[PDB]
């Protein structure tokens, strides 16, 4: 349903890439973005559904311009990047990923998190290397690359609460900024604040991103977070 | 051109795996293990050529033995796995796996006999899912005093393949010393040393075959060479 | 230079133990802490000179109230605490420590950093070794024990500078938060981006918390920050 | 009621030392070790009574050949360092300090680890900061300087055990190499993979020591290790 279009020429824009695709069916987004050297352009095209993209497909290989198109899929190319500081906005994200020379091919921003589109697998993979890690103003910088749809990488384990933290509605609340939670557990009877829970999200990147609770003060105790151990 | 066998009788060895699968096309590998409840055996199958792992599919919800078999394209199921014990055997690698219920479809290990310098294991796994889930619980464990390093496999322009080397004396900025101290790692492409260099700030770049490679190498940050501790990050991609 | 008074009556403020002290010399300051389980209290007294507190010392064993009182040097008993959330103030630092069962005797608070005063050399390393890395609202805190009073301890070394990035004055601007700067060094024609810069900070805290800059984006790059090695 | 000699001339064994001092008390030990530079010699002298220590003390500033030496309490210069290669000797020891420029004035080799003596302070504090976390072989290194000398930092906790790890043995056999062990603890009947036990060791290096076993697997589990909390 998604679609990377590589060597346009460098006058398109949105629109002029919108007129050209328009005749595969219904897009929902059009996003364009400059090349390296930024004498071409890249697209991300997102299509209604399955063969609403193949049609494009069938259109690589033709010359637009004086430069000839490359279409193919767009699969594996996303990631997602978290905690940075609230005032970094669209362009800060796309700065980083200039910094170390990856083409942003589209960023969707609203404990917030952004999913990051690039041009190839390698461009994926190799942003998470150079980034995960890296310090601005006194946050340090989160980012994987996605991971797409069992309870296999969804659950995590809440460990060192005490009675107090032990609650429902706290738990929620201090989870549910990562992503949607499916469902909190909270074994039965726990009355030396080694209380745990487990919860569980609806897609992996959301447990993921919960697993930055590790370490980290809730009420006041440091808490432990980890993926739970798949059921035998 | 690799393929997955779910559900074998529990009794199948290789023999019988390949008996049953030769006829689809040459078959360069076969591999079987046991499943988590010990009820049935997966194998892995590696044919010479594509056509060989499609006639391959084409035997899936057949009936081998008293089970009714899955067969599917494995594809990004693979991790690498090293800094463990010197001592360990693949039937270790197998009972860690184990101990986070992780199915091992194969291990591919330089046997003990060669006491292989920075020794790496090849790891296959049964789903996508498990190679993800498998890094991220075993990463940076600590197996008698060795912490842990594992990735999923990035398969094949010199994106991921090139490593910088710094804070290197100008006696450490050698040559031989450089490809003897990373040639474990895998197999080196080009040794690259900028002139003029000879305030211990020397670099050198190095280019692996695979990126496989050159990620291993990073276990060499933070790490002792001659009488610095270096660094090593992967190389700034190109403009 | 400074002086702990231990076990005095819970109802003693500040102002009477001022009281009780102010026949030893001038008082720069004075501060009061519950103990733990809150039935008696620590001073920290500071005073203008060494025999003003060696006067305060000959006080030790003295009974006030119906309480017998113990005083020492206070010394080894100093940490710095940096990079928690903008929002703290000096009662969220108070709770911190109170949540690992530590008293603090008193906290400074003016890139800002505390400085903070416990009852016991062990207080010191416990509550840094408790909470060193904690994460606090996506924060992760750094503390160190305090290092008193050539190079040694107080040289950093800036690595994988950027032609543009080795400037005096942008290196100036992002260091001097940490503390006085006494010298920076840019060895003559440097000019593949890995440059380098020394800086020499007054006191050695000061390039501990400088350590922070290591992997972290200055202006476009991942700047590395180490002690510098030292001279023969 | 160890005492740092300093500037001693640089053909002065331990011989001539032990001469020069002998009429300060008893002695227990000796150790000579070259300057950086090798220009003079420093000594650590053990006296067997603190009276000892303190007649040797107000030979500073003596005239020894023709150096004047400075003679000092050699207090709070004591790391200990473990995680290295199996093969390392002493010889390896010396040569790793060697490589930061750090003069070793003894060093004791008996899961092993080593204590080190230093000349100063700083170059205490300096050592553990250039040396902890290298990696020796595939062997990341653990330094911490030395904690002298209720159960504070003395205790650890061990979670995330299984049923068949709580066993008073297999915890003894597992955590003795890093000193002695006082009590271990198990809270009755814990029959969620959630299992812990409490370890008291004789001395906060070894507990500190036993840290190590935290992220690490022990029979078919990664267990969780950390300082105890103090008793409120």
New interface residues.
């Given amino acids: 349903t998604t679609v990377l279009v590589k060597n346009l020429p460098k006058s398109y824009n949105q629109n002029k890439v919108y007129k050209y695709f328009k005749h595969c069916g219904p897009i929902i987004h059009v996003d364009v973005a400059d090349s390296?050297?930024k004498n071409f352009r890249f697209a991300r095209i997102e299509f209604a559904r399955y063969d609403g993209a193949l049609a494009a497909i069938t259109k690589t290989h033709k010359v637009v311009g004086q430069n000839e198109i490359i279409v193919s899929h767009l699969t594996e190319c996303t990631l997602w990047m978290t905690?940075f500081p609230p005032s970094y906005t669209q362009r800060n994200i796309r700065?980083?990923l200039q910094?170390?020379?990856?083409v942003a091919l589209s960023i969707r921003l609203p404990?917030r998190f952004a999913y990051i589109d690039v041009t190839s697998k390698?461009?994926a993979?190799?942003c998470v290397?150079?980034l995960n890690?890296?310090?601005?103003e006194?946050?340090?910088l989160v980012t994987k690359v996605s991971?797409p749809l069992?309870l296999?990488?969804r659950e995590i384990m809440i460990?060192?609460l005490s009675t107090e933290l032990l609650d429902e509605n706290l738990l929620r609340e201090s989870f549910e900024g990562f992503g949607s939670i499916e469902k909190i557990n909270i074994?039965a009877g726990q009355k030396?604040?080694?209380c745990?829970a487990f919860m569980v999200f609806e897609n992996?990147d959301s447990a993921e991103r919960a697993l930055?609770?590790?370490?980290?003060?809730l009420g006041?105790?440091?808490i432990?977070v980890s993926?739970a151990?798949?059921?035998?």
Avoid: A
């Fill in positions: 390296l050297k905690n700065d980083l910094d170390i020379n990856v404990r390698e461009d993979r190799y290397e150079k890690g890296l310090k601005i006194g946050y340090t991971n069992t296999e990488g460990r060192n074994p030396f604040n080694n745990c992996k930055q609770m590790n370490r980290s003060l006041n105790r440091e432990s993926l151990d798949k059921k035998p």
